[PDB]
Design a protein around this ligand. Structure first.
Ligand code: HEM
Ligand SMILES: O=C1[C@H]2C[C@@H]3C[C@@H](C[C@H]1C3)C2
Length: 405
């Protein structure tokens, strides 16, 4: 289901890439996308899939377009257009200067200072989860770790019931990796139905949790509106529930297949941080976009007002012009170049938290379970979308090679 090519589009710029179901999926999701960067592919393509939209294929263009909010508006950041349109999250669906007051409040909630306060819990949960798995000699890493670890931390931060996870997680997933089961607007509303009463409650009676702080915040000197708070909290949820979770499964699938990479990290822990960045570059997973505010000519291509463009953050650090031998994982790259957390005014406030969680996982897993692999005859499936993911991750190990801490 291809949409008819609009008049302004040169047919030589056509490359029908399905962000929800790319052709090379079996190879790995990063590998499916990376098709976009082959020699046969122009820098700026038009896809007839998912209603028709441009895609920038190179790090140089992606960065440029991210910097340029004047032309590339966040007002409609998701594809398909109906999704982009229903999209009302704060501060993500706003351009500067309006975005700033909101970002500033989001940052109070998820920023460094919060990470620093949550450290011991992050550590405590990881060690608790891993120690619990260790003696088993096998898990479902996605379900057994990647999901609980980050989500239980977020639930704790937000002051929400762990019981709500399954419902919440389903809804967040419909938004990034739609099933057809629900439209975006519907998923969005259900999430909002959830949030509304909570916000009310926290406006009347303030906690110290993330939601209580957002609900009672000041922005441009006056108090945040209930609708505003609902719109920030909605984003905080998708961020917390759908990001780190997918990231850890890609990284663990790689560690499982690469003993040499595991060893390195065991012997020379001083490299953990560097390895983390390199994993963030290699297993990049987010792709959203922007909307043209007007007619514009970008790198010789005519963009029309209202066109959407996908600016795949995942792609920048996969770009040969940015990284020599991109698909190769090398812990000692002189320069790890990526835009994994985005670029421009919308750079991820949740990045400090995301790194702390990744570094603790790596440190803590490798300590106790140094030797593991993917289960004999399990087939690892990737899933593509706004945020890509791994279906299931069956791991096996010999209990006897583990170390109790
Ligand atoms: C590996 C993990 C993550 C990745 C790769 C990631 C990626 C991104 C990207 C690419 C953007 C900007 C998108 C755009 O410009 O439209 C973004 C923004 C944001 N992310 Fe992260 N995210 C991650 C984890 C988190 C976490 C754990 C949270 C906190 C709950 C979070 C909260 C946010 C927020 C609040 C923004 C909006 C900032 C603004 O609009 O000014 N993210 N993220
Ligand atoms: O609306 C969202 C923004 C862009 C990406 C990452 C995070 C959660 C979802 C998908 C921030």
């Amino acid at each position: 289901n291809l949409a008819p090519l609009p008049p302004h589009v040169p047919e030589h710029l056509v490359f029908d890439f399905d962000m929800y179901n790319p052709s090379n999926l079996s190879a790995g999701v990063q590998e499916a996308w990376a098709v976009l960067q082959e020699s046969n592919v122009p820098d700026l393509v038009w896809t007839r899939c998912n209603g028709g939209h441009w895609i920038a294929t190179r790090g140089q263009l992606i960065r440029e377009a991210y910097e340029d909010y004047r032309h590339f508006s966040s007002e409609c950041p998701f594809i398909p257009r109906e999704a982009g349109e229903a999209y009302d999250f704060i501060p993500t669906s706003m351009d500067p200067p309006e975005q700033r007051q909101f970002r500033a409040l989001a940052n109070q909630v998820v920023g460094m200072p919060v990470v620093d306060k949550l450290e011991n819990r992050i550590q405590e949960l990881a060690c608790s989860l891993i120690e619990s798995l260790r003696p088993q000699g096998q898990c479902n890493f996605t379900e057994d770790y990647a999901e609980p670890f980050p989500i239980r931390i977020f639930m704790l931060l937000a002051g929400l019931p762990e019981e709500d996870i399954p419902h919440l997680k389903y809804l967040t997933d419909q938004m990034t990796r739609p099933d057809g089961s629900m439209t975006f607007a519907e998923a969005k509303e259900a999430l909002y139905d959830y949030l509304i009463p909570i916000i009310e409650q926290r406006r009347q009676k303030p906690g110290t949790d993330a939601i209580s702080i957002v609900a009672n915040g000041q922005v441009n000197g006056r108090p945040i509106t209930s609708d505003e708070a609902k719109r920030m909290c909605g984003l905080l949820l998708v961020g917390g529930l759908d990001t780190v979770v997918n990231f850890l499964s890609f990284s663990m699938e790689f560690l499982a297949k690469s003993p040499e990479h595991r060893q390195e990290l065991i012997e020379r822990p001083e490299r953990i941080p560097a390895a983390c960045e390199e994993l963030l570059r290699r297993f990049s997973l987010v792709a959203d976009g922007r909307i043209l505010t007007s007619d514009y000519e970008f790198h010789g291509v005519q963009l029309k007002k209202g066109d959407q463009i996908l600016l795949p953050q995942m792609l920048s650090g996969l770009d040969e012009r940015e990284n020599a031998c991109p698909m190769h994982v090398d812990f000692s790259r002189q320069k790890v170049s990526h835009t994994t957390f985005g670029h421009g005014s919308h750079l991820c406030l949740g990045q400090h938290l995301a790194r702390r969680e990744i570094i603790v996982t790596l440190k803590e897993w490798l300590t106790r379970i140094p030797d593991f692999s993917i289960a004999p005859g399990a087939q690892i499936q990737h899933k593509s979308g706004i945020v890509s993911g791994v279906q299931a991750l069956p791991l096996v190990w010999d209990p006897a090679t583990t170390k109790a801490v």
